[PDB]
Amino acid sequence: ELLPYPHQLMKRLLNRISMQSQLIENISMGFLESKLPLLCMETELERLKFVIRSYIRCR
Amino acid sequence: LPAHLQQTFSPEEIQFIVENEPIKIFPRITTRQKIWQLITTDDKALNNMVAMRSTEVVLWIALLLKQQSKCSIVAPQWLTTKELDRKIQYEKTHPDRFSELPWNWLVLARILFNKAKDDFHDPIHELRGKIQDLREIRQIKVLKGLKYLNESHLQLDNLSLLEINELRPFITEIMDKLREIHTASL
Amino acid sequence: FRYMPFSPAGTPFGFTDRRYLTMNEVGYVSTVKNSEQYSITVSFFDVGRFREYHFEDLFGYDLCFLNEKGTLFGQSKTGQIQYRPHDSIHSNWTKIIPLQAGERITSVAATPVRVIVGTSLGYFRSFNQFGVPFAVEKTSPIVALTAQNYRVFSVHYSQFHGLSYSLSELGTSSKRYYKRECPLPMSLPNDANLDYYNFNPMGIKSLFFSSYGDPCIFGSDNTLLLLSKWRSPEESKWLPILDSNMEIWKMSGGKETTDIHVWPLALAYDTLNCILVKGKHIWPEFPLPLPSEMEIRMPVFVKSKLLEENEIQIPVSMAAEEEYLRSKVLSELLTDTLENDGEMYGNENEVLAALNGAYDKALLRLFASACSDQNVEKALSLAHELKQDRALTAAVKISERAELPSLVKKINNIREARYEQQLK
Amino acid sequence: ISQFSEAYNKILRNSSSHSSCQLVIFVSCLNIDALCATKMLSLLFKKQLVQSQIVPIFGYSELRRHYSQLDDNINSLLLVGFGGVIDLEAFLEIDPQEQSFRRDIYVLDAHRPWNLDNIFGSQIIQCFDDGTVDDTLGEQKEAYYKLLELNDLSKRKQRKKQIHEYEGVLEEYYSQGTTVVNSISAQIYSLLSAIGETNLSNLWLNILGTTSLDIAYAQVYNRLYPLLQDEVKRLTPSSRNSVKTPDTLTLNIQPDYYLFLLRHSSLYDSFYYSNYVNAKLSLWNENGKKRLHKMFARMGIPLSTAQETWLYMDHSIKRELGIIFDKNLDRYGLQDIIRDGFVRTLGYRGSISASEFVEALTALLEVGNSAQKLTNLRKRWVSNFWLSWDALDDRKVELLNRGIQLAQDLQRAIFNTGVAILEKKLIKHLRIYRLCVLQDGPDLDLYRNPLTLLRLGNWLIECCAESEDKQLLPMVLASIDENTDTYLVAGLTPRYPRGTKKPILNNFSMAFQQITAETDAKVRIDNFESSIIEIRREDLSPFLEKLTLSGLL
Amino acid sequence: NGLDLMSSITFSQQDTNNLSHQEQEYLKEYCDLITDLKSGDLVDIDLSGSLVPPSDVFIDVRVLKDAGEIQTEYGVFNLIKDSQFFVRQSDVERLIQQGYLQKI
């Protein structure tokens, strides 16, 4: 069956994704020796993005 | 519309779930402070590490740092030639049970042996000898546990996550044809 | 009896032909036989601030001391040293030591200001970090030497004096000695490991320092000592804190075994990093395995009284007394390091606070058992040590549950005298 | 002048960023030495996370189209194999583009003439000017400085005599033969020793680096050998080994012989298709093939066993091969057979030596895949380059065992051509050099690749210029096909029969170059090397007569 | 359709004859129903492709025989035939689906 949608938490995450995706562009442009922290946050954001893109597209 | 399989997990979506469980590392870059920071959403601590002092990170970061050799994956409690011998001799003397598996049974035996094969105690014919031996004892009792299936109930007390995602589309397509005979005759 | 050159946690050749020369908490140095020459590797445990290299020997070095600033090599017969700084800006230098007839070099040291070469007749030559000599001093023969940030620890020995340490601190110009030749409690020795005792007769495996500034020494009794209150002249005690004959016996399921050994590298806040070598030969081999850990336990267990209670499971009535000692000892090494020099990292206050919380809590597993067997005097004296005051009224509610009513008065007699103390 | 670690950080300050095409490297498709030198230049840029290109370049005109078209994100450039001899500012037409130039070029070369307008005048072209190839020669230096400065008749004629004598010194340099000083794949390992990444795999790309120039090249291999016999002893797991576990790659030095492909063919089929057996027994005739069976009589090997493949020989014969090769090998002169070589076993697979690996890469580079019929061939070589780049690794062994069975059918088609020359005797024995021109025969399609003529030409040089003193003269080869009659000619060099004082050994760059600017009769210089060209069929006869004139040898 | 093309009427579904007149107008309106959805999420513009889970952030991409130096978004690529790369997986998934770069 079709389960009831989590209407309250999934307003937070779409307001949490667009916040940090500016902060990656703000650090990586605003920096210009440590290329390692900038490739962990780039990996995680494209890993939280895959859960939503395979949850909405499953309903 | 996924339309490939759409009812099970494909086994590239099983290495995505097991990579959210923490293990220990022996780091090789300090970055603590003395008297720029990793600010990710889901873990957001352990900026403060010391060279050769154990800490606990999530597993998908500790495969990023092994590729550059700035970490070293420690063994868990089960990758031990002294510990896996009790979990084999349990299996012979109890032909009805499943002995015990830490639920990342097969998956953590793959991502560690391909990537981190310098940190155990002799994986050659000591750990790949047992883990293939413990998968062929276990795959007998699954095969004898399907002559006894019914149309109301089943018990599968302790099975892993990869020994189930190869067995869903066999059982739930047959047990949906034993339900539609017993209730169609009533 | 013979003198052999000593280096921290070295290992001999054996039947093979490549060994380590030193091994400590920064890196490990290995050597490899080329029949004519040697190829020395300097590999590091840290990766970020340092690089590894390798170079070719033409003299036959067998003494080294690897630390953060430099890498002081040595030669045991010709008296030839070489100092290779990790920085590319400062250049090397080489000096040849005067030697008399029938003399060796035992061990060297590489403090950030001084450079110490101690020979096997007692001479104590001290350079500066470029090669200008400062002193020549005659002491007892030296068989080990090590250093941290500014302090220097050493072990004298003679054929008639006996073992004696000495703990000094060559600062900028301050040369405040602390202990000059006081005696030291350790047992020297008197098979597959006969190749080891020809290499190091003294039996000291690897002496080092802590990360907080406390000397340690890992004897051949397999019992890591430690020195406390060394800033005071008349309060130094040698607290043993680990038995490697006991932690192995627990982990082998209550059994004697001759396969697991212990090789130490360094010490942390409360953990010891160890190379658990498995085999007959008690030195590690190449490649160097991952350093495991091991916790410290004060030696209060009994080898016999655990076996009558049947991995090894301990009853709580015996495990309670050990945590009483262990948080008692660890506080005295932490409460003075802040008061005299201070804290390095900043988080030293909260671990101090949570260590007191393990101190009073572990006493109350014992305090309740003292009321269980109808004893008022034994349970009375235990309530004079709780410096935490919020556990004092917590003990009163355990006094009523055991129904020893006179004991309930005595604890409230303790609270009032410590209450009037605060007002003055 | 420029060492490595100060130049290594000069490439990381301007390449670690967000955009992808920050640096671009160029590889010549022919030098196997230039193949291993970039395979371990990707591993160095994979552990430090820099994004790049790897573009193969065949010709000399194809460098101009690829460079003069795609110039947006050149924050660095890199160039391996090329760029040694020909002046790059005068060929790419580069002008001042703003200290703090926008573009750096780091050439890597293995050739003799330093081409002083690249090393000196280093505005943008970063040199490679450590004293390895440089050798710190000063007479070249001051003459270049006492030239670029542009009673007055007395000093100016004295200046004109000083102009006259100094260009005489500049005609003592720039008048020399092009051969190899150092290998490239030993030079990059000297950069990897200083940074601190030397694995066991990054050693296996020097043993394949400096064995490619042992067989068919000058031998500096005798001077590069004691440096690699110590880096193997240094990285060794233990003295006594476990008994053959399915892990644990162990490379270790072993007494290895000079035959071609012992481990993957029979004994008898290796004694035919060799060089230092063919050079001493003259196997192309019939009078020498009787002497070959005369060896196996003495050695105690039947002629059924000696053609079984080397896996299925008996246990008590491969045990005793190091012993029989020294009692009976003296009488036929073959005593320079036993050398010391390297063997890399990956567990249960089996042993492959060093020389038996570089044959399987020189034979995977041309097989096993008007003017616009030409460039449709050059895309069959550039696309063939990635067919060895993958096979170099340790994961794909089904790609390697295609290579060995493509290698034995290379040196079976050469041996049946090189016999058909030495019966008809198509050699002109002229007063300056020797000449051969091949016009007709079987399988003449194979000989369009420059790595195939140098295989056959290396079989002729060690054949006739042998231990027997006749003379010492260069060869000139010329093969032919259809399709506008290309006539791929190639100048070769003489050798000594291994028993090393004259290292110059080449002249076909200078004296050839004067003729192509004299009539320019239908010639194209389209190679990394200056000693191989094409020429039309009507231009062969008047060109060769001019070679005998103005002889510089 | 709608994957690094953003208006793909032609160039895909190369038959355009096996469909009826009614099934060829149903499809063309349905692709405009998709682009309503990708404008109100902003998880990613065109959330369509890549249902493979992400791993191994830096990949090796070998060009298979398609010149053009076509790409402008996130920098030019200067694309030449048979020359492999080391770029991250975010910029190639828009081209690895076109049959244009062969290796993963």
Short mmCIF file of C-alpha atoms in Angstrom, two decimals, chain C residues 24-404:
data_model
loop_
_atom_site.label_atom_id
_atom_site.label_comp_id
_atom_site.label_asym_id
_atom_site.label_seq_id
_atom_site.Cartn_x
_atom_site.Cartn_y
_atom_site.Cartn_z
CA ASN C 24 59.16 5.05 19.26
CA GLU C 25 56.09 7.23 18.95
CA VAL C 26 57.30 9.15 15.88
CA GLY C 27 58.75 6.65 13.45
CA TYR C 28 60.70 3.47 13.08
CA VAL C 29 64.12 3.12 11.46
CA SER C 30 65.12 -0.07 9.70
CA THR C 31 68.38 -1.27 8.19
CA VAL C 32 69.19 -3.81 5.47
CA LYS C 33 72.40 -5.73 4.76
CA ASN C 34 74.22 -5.20 1.53
CA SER C 35 77.35 -7.34 2.23
CA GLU C 36 79.59 -4.32 1.81
CA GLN C 37 77.23 -1.58 2.95
CA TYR C 38 73.84 -0.79 4.47
CA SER C 39 70.64 0.88 3.28
CA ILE C 40 68.92 2.78 6.08
CA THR C 41 65.21 3.65 5.95
CA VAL C 42 63.53 6.30 8.13
CA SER C 43 59.78 5.73 7.96
CA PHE C 44 57.27 7.69 9.99
CA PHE C 45 54.02 6.99 11.81
CA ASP C 46 52.77 10.51 11.22
CA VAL C 47 52.22 11.45 7.60
CA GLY C 48 51.29 15.15 7.44
CA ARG C 49 54.23 17.22 8.61
CA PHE C 50 56.96 14.74 7.65
CA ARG C 51 58.30 12.73 4.74
CA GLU C 52 60.20 9.44 4.64
CA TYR C 53 63.50 8.89 2.90
CA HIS C 54 66.32 6.42 2.56
CA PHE C 55 70.03 6.71 1.97
CA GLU C 56 73.19 4.66 1.66
CA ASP C 57 75.57 3.90 4.51
CA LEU C 58 79.32 3.53 4.07
CA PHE C 59 80.35 3.29 7.73
CA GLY C 60 78.12 0.76 9.48
CA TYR C 61 75.82 2.74 11.80
CA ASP C 62 74.19 0.87 14.68
CA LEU C 63 72.99 3.66 16.99
CA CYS C 64 70.26 6.18 16.36
CA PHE C 65 67.72 8.38 18.11
CA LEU C 66 64.76 9.57 16.08
CA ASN C 67 62.62 12.48 17.23
CA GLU C 68 60.91 15.58 15.89
CA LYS C 69 63.78 17.97 15.22
CA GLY C 70 66.59 15.77 13.93
CA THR C 71 67.93 12.23 13.60
CA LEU C 72 71.20 11.61 15.43
CA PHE C 73 73.08 8.59 14.12
CA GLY C 74 76.16 6.92 15.55
CA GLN C 75 78.95 4.36 15.17
CA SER C 76 79.99 2.01 17.94
CA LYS C 77 83.70 1.47 17.25
CA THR C 78 85.25 4.39 15.35
CA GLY C 79 83.36 7.05 17.28
CA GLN C 80 81.64 8.72 14.35
CA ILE C 81 78.30 10.50 14.51
CA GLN C 82 76.17 12.33 11.96
CA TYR C 83 73.18 14.62 12.47
CA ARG C 84 70.52 14.81 9.76
CA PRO C 85 67.81 17.41 10.41
CA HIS C 86 64.41 16.88 8.83
CA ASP C 87 64.34 20.45 7.56
CA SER C 88 65.90 21.17 4.19
CA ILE C 89 67.22 24.60 5.20
CA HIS C 90 69.70 23.59 7.90
CA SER C 91 72.64 21.50 6.77
CA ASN C 92 74.16 18.37 8.31
CA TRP C 93 77.41 18.04 10.21
CA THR C 94 79.79 15.30 11.24
CA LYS C 95 82.14 15.00 14.21
CA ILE C 96 84.51 12.25 15.29
CA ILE C 97 84.57 11.44 19.01
CA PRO C 98 87.87 10.83 20.85
CA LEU C 99 88.15 7.23 22.02
CA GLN C 100 90.75 5.51 24.15
CA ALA C 101 91.83 1.88 23.99
CA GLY C 102 89.07 -0.67 24.45
CA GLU C 103 86.13 1.73 24.51
CA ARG C 104 82.70 1.88 22.88
CA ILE C 105 79.72 4.19 22.55
CA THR C 106 76.60 2.96 24.34
CA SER C 107 73.77 5.40 23.68
CA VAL C 108 73.10 8.89 22.32
CA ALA C 109 70.45 11.58 22.75
CA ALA C 110 68.98 14.35 20.61
CA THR C 111 67.36 17.04 22.82
CA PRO C 112 66.30 20.19 20.89
CA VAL C 113 69.19 22.24 22.36
CA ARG C 114 71.91 19.79 23.37
CA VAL C 115 73.34 16.60 21.87
CA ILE C 116 74.60 14.02 24.35
CA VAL C 117 76.97 11.17 23.58
CA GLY C 118 77.68 8.88 26.53
CA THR C 119 80.43 6.31 26.20
CA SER C 120 81.26 3.14 28.12
CA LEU C 121 83.89 4.58 30.44
CA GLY C 122 81.74 7.34 31.86
CA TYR C 123 82.43 10.37 29.73
CA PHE C 124 79.54 12.74 29.11
CA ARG C 125 80.18 14.91 26.07
CA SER C 126 77.67 17.65 25.33
CA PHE C 127 77.62 19.64 22.09
CA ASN C 128 75.15 22.19 20.79
CA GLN C 129 72.83 21.63 17.85
CA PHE C 130 75.49 22.69 15.30
CA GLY C 131 78.65 21.05 16.62
CA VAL C 132 80.30 23.33 19.17
CA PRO C 133 81.36 21.40 22.30
CA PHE C 134 80.30 22.59 25.74
CA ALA C 135 81.52 20.19 28.42
CA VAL C 136 83.21 16.92 29.26
CA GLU C 137 82.06 15.24 32.46
CA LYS C 138 82.97 11.96 34.13
CA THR C 139 80.18 9.88 35.66
CA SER C 140 79.35 6.22 36.07
CA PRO C 141 79.07 4.13 32.86
CA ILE C 142 75.82 4.69 31.00
CA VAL C 143 73.73 1.93 29.45
CA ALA C 144 70.58 3.80 28.34
CA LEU C 145 69.58 7.37 27.53
CA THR C 146 66.47 9.16 26.31
CA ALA C 147 64.86 12.57 26.26
CA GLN C 148 61.73 14.58 25.64
CA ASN C 149 61.15 18.39 25.13
CA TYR C 150 63.87 19.53 27.54
CA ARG C 151 64.43 16.79 30.08
CA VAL C 152 66.86 13.87 29.97
CA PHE C 153 66.54 10.48 31.67
CA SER C 154 69.42 8.04 32.01
CA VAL C 155 70.42 4.76 33.65
CA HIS C 156 73.91 4.44 35.09
CA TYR C 157 75.49 1.07 35.90
CA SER C 158 78.84 -0.33 36.96
CA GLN C 159 80.19 -3.74 37.81
CA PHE C 160 80.10 -2.80 41.49
CA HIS C 161 77.88 0.28 41.94
CA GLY C 162 74.54 -1.11 40.79
CA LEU C 163 71.63 0.35 38.85
CA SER C 164 70.90 4.03 39.38
CA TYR C 165 68.82 6.52 37.43
CA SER C 166 69.36 10.26 37.11
CA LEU C 167 66.84 12.78 35.92
CA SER C 168 68.01 16.21 34.81
CA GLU C 169 66.70 19.09 32.74
CA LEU C 170 69.04 21.13 30.53
CA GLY C 171 66.86 24.10 29.73
CA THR C 172 67.96 27.38 28.19
CA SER C 173 70.62 27.97 30.84
CA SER C 174 68.96 26.31 33.87
CA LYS C 175 70.54 22.98 34.76
CA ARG C 176 68.31 22.00 37.69
CA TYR C 177 69.00 18.40 38.58
CA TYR C 178 66.21 16.51 40.26
CA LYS C 179 67.62 13.10 41.23
CA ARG C 180 71.35 12.49 40.95
CA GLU C 181 72.14 8.76 41.18
CA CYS C 182 69.40 7.37 43.39
CA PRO C 183 68.85 3.59 43.29
CA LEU C 184 66.23 2.03 41.08
CA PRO C 185 63.90 -0.92 41.68
CA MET C 186 64.31 -3.33 38.76
CA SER C 187 65.35 -6.94 38.30
CA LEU C 188 68.08 -7.88 35.86
CA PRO C 189 68.10 -11.37 34.35
CA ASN C 190 70.38 -14.16 35.58
CA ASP C 191 65.87 -21.74 24.88
CA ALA C 192 64.74 -20.01 21.70
CA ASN C 193 65.50 -16.53 23.06
CA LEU C 194 69.20 -17.02 23.69
CA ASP C 195 69.80 -14.84 20.64
CA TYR C 196 68.14 -12.00 22.50
CA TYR C 197 70.20 -12.04 25.69
CA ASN C 198 73.46 -11.90 23.76
CA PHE C 199 72.17 -8.72 22.13
CA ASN C 200 70.90 -6.85 25.19
CA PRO C 201 72.27 -8.18 28.48
CA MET C 202 70.86 -5.37 30.62
CA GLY C 203 67.31 -6.54 29.97
CA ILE C 204 65.72 -3.12 29.55
CA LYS C 205 63.51 -3.45 26.50
CA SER C 206 62.50 0.14 25.89
CA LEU C 207 62.44 3.09 28.24
CA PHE C 208 60.53 6.18 27.23
CA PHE C 209 58.41 9.04 28.49
CA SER C 210 54.69 9.58 28.78
CA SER C 211 52.68 12.11 26.85
CA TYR C 212 52.33 14.13 30.06
CA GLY C 213 55.92 14.07 31.26
CA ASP C 214 56.22 11.00 33.45
CA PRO C 215 59.12 8.54 33.11
CA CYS C 216 58.42 4.90 32.45
CA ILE C 217 60.56 1.81 31.97
CA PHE C 218 59.58 -1.60 30.65
CA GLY C 219 61.78 -4.12 32.43
CA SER C 220 62.44 -7.73 31.57
CA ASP C 221 59.97 -8.74 34.29
CA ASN C 222 57.28 -7.55 31.81
CA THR C 223 55.98 -5.02 34.31
CA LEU C 224 55.66 -1.41 33.22
CA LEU C 225 56.70 0.89 36.06
CA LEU C 226 56.03 4.63 36.34
CA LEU C 227 57.41 7.48 38.43
CA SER C 228 55.17 9.81 40.41
CA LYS C 229 55.71 13.16 42.16
CA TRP C 230 59.10 13.62 40.53
CA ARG C 231 58.94 17.39 40.87
CA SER C 232 59.24 16.84 44.63
CA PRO C 233 62.62 15.74 46.02
CA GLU C 234 61.36 13.39 48.71
CA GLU C 235 58.08 11.87 47.46
CA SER C 236 59.04 9.82 44.39
CA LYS C 237 57.40 6.40 44.29
CA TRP C 238 57.56 3.72 41.62
CA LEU C 239 53.96 2.63 40.99
CA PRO C 240 53.65 -0.56 38.92
CA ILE C 241 50.57 -0.39 36.74
CA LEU C 242 50.63 -3.38 34.37
CA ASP C 243 51.59 -7.04 34.33
CA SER C 244 52.04 -8.61 30.92
CA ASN C 245 52.08 -12.00 32.62
CA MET C 246 48.50 -11.36 33.75
CA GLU C 247 46.71 -9.69 30.83
CA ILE C 248 47.75 -12.57 28.60
CA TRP C 249 46.56 -15.15 31.14
CA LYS C 250 43.11 -13.58 31.20
CA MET C 251 42.80 -13.42 27.42
CA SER C 252 43.95 -17.01 26.89
CA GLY C 253 41.00 -18.33 28.88
CA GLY C 254 42.75 -19.03 32.17
CA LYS C 255 45.70 -20.84 30.68
CA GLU C 256 49.47 -20.70 30.46
CA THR C 257 50.55 -20.04 26.88
CA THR C 258 53.90 -19.32 25.23
CA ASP C 259 52.78 -17.62 22.02
CA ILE C 260 51.66 -14.05 22.79
CA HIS C 261 54.16 -11.48 24.03
CA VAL C 262 54.28 -7.74 24.60
CA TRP C 263 56.46 -5.12 22.92
CA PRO C 264 55.76 -1.52 23.92
CA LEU C 265 56.02 1.66 21.91
CA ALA C 266 54.62 4.53 23.94
CA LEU C 267 52.11 5.56 26.57
CA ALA C 268 48.94 7.65 26.39
CA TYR C 269 46.57 9.08 29.01
CA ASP C 270 45.62 5.60 30.24
CA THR C 271 46.33 3.23 27.35
CA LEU C 272 49.49 1.45 26.20
CA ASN C 273 50.14 0.92 22.49
CA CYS C 274 51.59 -2.51 21.92
CA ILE C 275 52.96 -4.68 19.14
CA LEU C 276 51.45 -8.04 20.04
CA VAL C 277 54.10 -10.30 18.54
CA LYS C 278 52.92 -13.89 18.08
CA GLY C 279 55.50 -16.66 17.89
CA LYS C 280 58.59 -17.96 19.60
CA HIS C 281 60.78 -15.00 18.70
CA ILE C 282 59.68 -12.15 20.92
CA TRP C 283 60.75 -9.38 18.63
CA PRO C 284 58.50 -8.16 15.81
CA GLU C 285 59.51 -8.91 12.24
CA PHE C 286 59.07 -7.18 8.92
CA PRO C 287 56.62 -5.67 8.08
CA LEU C 288 55.67 -3.99 11.32
CA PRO C 289 52.08 -4.90 12.30
CA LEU C 290 49.48 -2.47 13.48
CA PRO C 291 49.94 -1.20 17.03
CA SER C 292 47.08 -2.52 19.15
CA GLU C 293 46.10 -1.12 22.52
CA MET C 294 45.81 -2.46 26.06
CA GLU C 295 44.41 -0.93 29.24
CA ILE C 296 46.15 -0.51 32.57
CA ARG C 297 45.07 -2.44 35.65
CA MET C 298 46.61 -2.28 39.10
CA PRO C 299 47.91 -5.73 40.09
CA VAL C 300 45.43 -6.84 42.76
CA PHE C 301 44.04 -10.03 41.24
CA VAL C 302 44.79 -13.59 42.34
CA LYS C 303 45.73 -16.35 39.90
CA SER C 304 44.06 -18.94 42.12
CA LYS C 305 40.96 -17.17 43.46
CA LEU C 306 39.57 -16.51 39.99
CA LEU C 307 39.73 -20.18 38.99
CA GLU C 308 37.53 -21.23 41.90
CA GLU C 309 34.83 -18.89 40.58
CA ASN C 310 34.49 -21.15 37.53
CA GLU C 311 37.59 -15.82 28.66
CA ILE C 312 37.68 -14.98 32.37
CA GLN C 313 34.78 -13.41 34.26
CA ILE C 314 35.45 -11.51 37.50
CA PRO C 315 32.92 -11.16 40.35
CA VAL C 316 32.02 -7.58 41.28
CA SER C 317 33.13 -8.14 44.88
CA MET C 318 36.69 -8.42 43.58
CA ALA C 319 36.47 -5.93 40.71
CA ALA C 320 35.38 -3.11 43.02
CA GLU C 321 38.70 -2.68 44.82
CA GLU C 322 40.75 -2.35 41.62
CA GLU C 323 38.82 0.66 40.31
CA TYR C 324 39.27 2.20 43.75
CA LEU C 325 43.05 2.22 43.35
CA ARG C 326 43.15 3.09 39.67
CA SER C 327 41.24 6.35 39.85
CA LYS C 328 43.12 7.16 43.04
CA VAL C 329 46.49 6.88 41.30
CA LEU C 330 45.47 8.63 38.08
CA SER C 331 44.30 11.71 39.96
CA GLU C 332 47.72 12.39 41.50
CA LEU C 333 49.36 12.43 38.07
CA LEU C 334 46.68 14.79 36.76
CA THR C 335 46.16 17.19 39.67
CA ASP C 336 49.81 18.26 39.70
CA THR C 337 50.41 18.53 35.94
CA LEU C 338 47.89 21.35 35.83
CA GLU C 339 49.15 23.01 39.01
CA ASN C 340 52.86 23.10 38.13
CA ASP C 341 53.15 23.46 34.36
CA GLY C 342 49.59 23.39 33.07
CA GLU C 343 47.49 21.72 30.41
CA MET C 344 48.46 21.39 26.77
CA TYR C 345 45.28 20.57 24.88
CA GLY C 346 42.62 22.31 26.97
CA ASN C 347 40.26 19.42 27.72
CA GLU C 348 42.17 18.40 30.85
CA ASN C 349 39.55 19.70 33.28
CA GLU C 350 36.59 17.57 32.21
CA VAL C 351 38.49 14.27 32.26
CA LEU C 352 39.59 15.28 35.75
CA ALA C 353 35.94 15.80 36.69
CA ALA C 354 34.75 12.48 35.27
CA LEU C 355 37.63 10.69 36.98
CA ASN C 356 36.33 11.78 40.38
CA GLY C 357 32.93 10.42 39.38
CA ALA C 358 34.49 7.00 38.91
CA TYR C 359 36.22 7.35 42.28
CA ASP C 360 33.23 7.74 44.59
CA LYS C 361 31.02 5.39 42.56
CA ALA C 362 33.48 2.50 42.72
CA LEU C 363 33.71 2.91 46.48
CA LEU C 364 29.97 2.39 46.91
CA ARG C 365 30.08 -1.15 45.56
CA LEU C 366 32.37 -1.87 48.51
CA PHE C 367 30.62 0.33 51.08
CA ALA C 368 27.36 -1.56 50.62
CA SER C 369 29.09 -4.91 51.11
CA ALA C 370 30.52 -3.65 54.40
CA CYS C 371 27.02 -3.02 55.72
CA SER C 372 25.82 -6.38 54.38
CA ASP C 373 27.91 -8.36 56.88
CA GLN C 374 26.97 -6.21 59.93
CA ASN C 375 30.13 -4.14 60.25
CA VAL C 376 29.92 -0.53 61.40
CA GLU C 377 33.60 0.30 61.94
CA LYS C 378 34.82 -0.87 58.53
CA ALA C 379 32.07 1.05 56.76
CA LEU C 380 32.72 4.12 58.92
CA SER C 381 36.29 4.89 57.83
CA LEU C 382 35.41 4.60 54.13
CA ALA C 383 33.29 7.77 54.37
CA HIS C 384 36.30 10.02 55.07
CA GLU C 385 37.69 9.89 51.53
CA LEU C 386 34.74 11.04 49.41
CA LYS C 387 35.81 14.52 48.36
CA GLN C 388 32.60 14.60 46.34
CA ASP C 389 29.99 15.93 48.75
CA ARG C 390 26.90 14.91 46.78
CA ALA C 391 27.68 11.23 47.43
CA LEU C 392 27.81 11.80 51.20
CA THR C 393 24.03 12.16 51.56
CA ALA C 394 23.76 9.34 49.01
CA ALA C 395 25.44 7.01 51.50
CA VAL C 396 22.87 7.84 54.21
CA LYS C 397 20.08 6.25 52.17
CA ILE C 398 22.18 3.09 51.92
CA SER C 399 22.66 3.12 55.69
CA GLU C 400 18.94 2.92 56.43
CA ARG C 401 18.34 0.11 53.92
CA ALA C 402 20.80 -2.12 55.77
CA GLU C 403 19.40 -1.01 59.19
CA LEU C 404 22.56 -0.05 61.06
#
